[PDB]
Structure 1
């Protein structure tokens, strides 16, 4: 029960998800074919949340892979773990979003979304008791920003009670990967604040550091960055898929981490993150995993938490460990950083412990941080937005696809109705 339908939009969400279903199929002992080949029934105890059992004791991933061009899917369906998905789920268009939000949300998104929701409604009725939908997309792309935020507006109307957690790859502070990514972000944050119960801001600049600084990867490809995003993604729902000494799920992480319904923009974090040689020179203890999370250099959203206050904090742990060793360290980082945590939420640390470690690990963590440090995430984008929009640059690639300037006047004001709220609840006594 409590099944989760995984939706992938954009080139980015497919490349994360194809690595994400590599982690899930290893945690559950699933072969490349689709059959179970693990050791214990605990992998088969909650196999049903991400898997439908097909005939012949094979399992298909409960995944809906959406694109607007076939270039990403043919890399997915022909690579490793590509013969495990159903061929029905690959719902892709032909024209491509063109790295455009309006082509992803109005023109080519709407000409595919009815063939997507009928695969959603097919998978949603195949669920026993639906927990909610997780989505993996970007905010700089055209499909993942356009088709993704079009899927959320259709789903929240059709499923108002279910949780809608998105794994949005927010654009990077230093470099861009798209000229019009301040436009694709601001038009998506207009659609994320009203229809998602939570949203995990990830930056590619921060994962460039964590591969180089923390893991000592001189040559990190996307296959190395996506194994860090998927380590968070499997680590969020690891207490829903496995027994633990203190089980959490996607509603405990919704209630405990969202004090105000707009302010559901989180930053993740993972621990342990070690190098190849430097993992035998380190004691894997809960006080070691705790202080590895709460520093600046282990935040996957490229912002220092010292510039803001943590509103709420979740620390989902994996592997066998003792609860006092946890609960002291959840207190220990709150005593020394009492100004760094928000004051009017006393004891703002959510704790979750799973009994099953990741494969090849003794114990592991999964940090979820809701801070006012990501007001600078939107101070940067809305400054990059307004510098482009006051010259009306690239406007005709959106106005020609069915959009007015009133769409931008609202979406910029909606983001500055969110920057002023993190400033309100950082200044709150």
Structure 2
């Protein structure tokens, strides 16, 4: 059992969903028609991949997933694209008119008209589970739908499924590919309203991904496709422990216990290696040591910040492929003797390690090399609060003049919601300060 349900919200969430499900199909040997010849138990089973896929009597393997957008053109591409047969039509839900980059339309004016249908389709998925574990929610911070509708949905899920865990994958805005001036408003509004409803959230900064694609894959001007394929490799590293078995495999829930010391402090920093082109991977085999070292190079982080000027509260290493513990231990010993790794005084310094043997996969025609071994580090560090600071400053500059605020008031919001949200962010920055001070 232990099933998980994925929810993909708005453009960014949908398109990242496409990249993730394509990659999962390649990892498990599922064809685009849904057939899986290696699966000899027809119509059911409790194999590890059944946490993410259900099975019909006709042998089709069907994602446990809902896609939601308030306009139709992005999800229409899924309806007509390569993987159109993977999904039942009731899983693909669209309205007619979007939120126009406005949190208030996604949470209230437009969002209210579709929330009950979305919840009922989710209920249909939940009823097929024999031991549902929780939810995975994919969305942008900056869009009207990804911010406001996601907020609304999280509130309703807490009502209908109680304390059942909810995890986020959240796209943090960058000016190089950003399309709206108001993205800082939406980011604070959704972060305030979701903070009590989420158990754990993985932020992905578009500027970090853009930089990595340019520097390591030699792509002059990266597209959404490049970014989403790399993101999907990180997501796959995180969920691999849920989707494959094995004796050195370590459950993600067990990492959550270690990653979250207080309910509000639930935002891990992800780092992935190696990201390398085919031309450079040739005749250059990367060892366990080289990739483990690369996990402490800030240029490989998913969020721009400097862990060397904060403190660690947890540090986890998720290996996949041709990796044995002996080489892990030698690499860790070296890193401990060489780098600036300072823990808070109320927390032990041991690194937690997992190994999955199933090797990494790449998509055909991609810009990533196929490699024999890879690693994802997840750290809980105070340095991540720098990203909140950057966003809060931009919020202040505009709000002092009330710029664009009339667009929100016209949909029924009050200024009090702006200032209440901003205060909650101020208190979060203060929490991150308090957890790094020494005991007395």
Same fold (TM over 0.5): yes
Q: Which runs of structure 2 are paired with 1:305-384 in the superposition (5 Å)?
A: 305-359=307-361, 360-384=370-394
- 1:252-300 deviation line (CA, Å, top 9, x unaligned): 1211101111111122221221112111243322111211112111011
Which moves more between the two structures, 90-99 or 327-336? 327-336
Partner Cα distance (1:331, 1:94) in 2: 57
**CA gap 1:348/1:80 in 2 versus in 1, 3 angstroms:** farther
Give the secondary structure class of the aligned counterpart of 2:104.
helix
Q: Which residue of 1 aligns with 2:169?
A: 167
Partner Cα distance (1:348, 1:39) in 2: 39
Q: Which residue of 1 aligns with 2:16?
A: 16
**CA gap 1:76/1:175 in 2 versus in 1, 3 angstroms:** closer
Cα RMSD between the aligned structures?
2.0
2:4 aligned with 1:4, yes or no? yes
2:402 aligned with 1:400, yes or no? no
Partner Cα distance (2:401, 2:233) in 1: 41
Partner Cα distance (2:179, 2:40) in 1: 44
Following superposition, the deviation at residue 323 of structure 1 comes to 1.3
Partner Cα distance (1:371, 1:195) in 2: 21
Following superposition, the deviation at residue 216 of structure 1 comes to 2.2
Following superposition, the deviation at residue 30 of structure 1 comes to 0.9
The question of whether the paired residues in 1 share the 8 Å contact of 2:52 and 2:243 is answered with no
The question of whether the paired residues in 2 share the 8 Å contact of 1:173 and 1:302 is answered with no
- 1:21-47 deviation line (CA, Å, top 9, x unaligned): 110111111111111145899x98222
Q: Which residue of 2 aligns with 1:28?
A: 28
Following superposition, the deviation at residue 220 of structure 1 comes to 2.4
Following superposition, the deviation at residue 385 of structure 1 comes to 0.8
Q: Which runs of structure 2 are paired with 1:92-107 in the superposition (5 Å)?
A: 92-107=94-109
Partner Cα distance (1:117, 1:365) in 2: 36
Which moves more between the two structures, 61-70 or 347-356? 347-356
**CA gap 1:215/1:310 in 2 versus in 1, 3 angstroms:** farther
Give the secondary structure class of the aligned counterpart of 1:237.
helix
The question of whether the paired residues in 1 share the 8 Å contact of 2:343 and 2:349 is answered with no
The question of whether the paired residues in 1 share the 8 Å contact of 2:312 and 2:341 is answered with no
Where does structure 2 lack aligned partners over 5 or more consecutive residues? 362-369
**CA gap 1:332/1:147 in 2 versus in 1, 3 angstroms:** farther
Where does structure 1 lack aligned partners over 5 or more consecutive residues? none
Q: Which residue of 1 aligns with 2:272?
A: 270
2:249 aligned with 1:247, yes or no? yes
Q: Which residue of 2 aligns with 1:151?
A: 153
TM-score (norm 1): 0.94
2:209 aligned with 1:207, yes or no? yes
Partner Cα distance (2:216, 2:342) in 1: 23
Partner Cα distance (2:303, 2:178) in 1: 15
Following superposition, the deviation at residue 311 of structure 1 comes to 2.2
Give the secondary structure class of the aligned counterpart of 2:5.
strand
TM-score (norm 2): 0.92
**CA gap 1:246/1:161 in 2 versus in 1, 3 angstroms:** farther
Q: Which residue of 1 aligns with 2:430?
A: 420
The question of whether the paired residues in 2 share the 8 Å contact of 1:28 and 1:44 is answered with no
- 1:385-419 deviation line (CA, Å, top 9, x unaligned): 11111111111111122211111111111111111
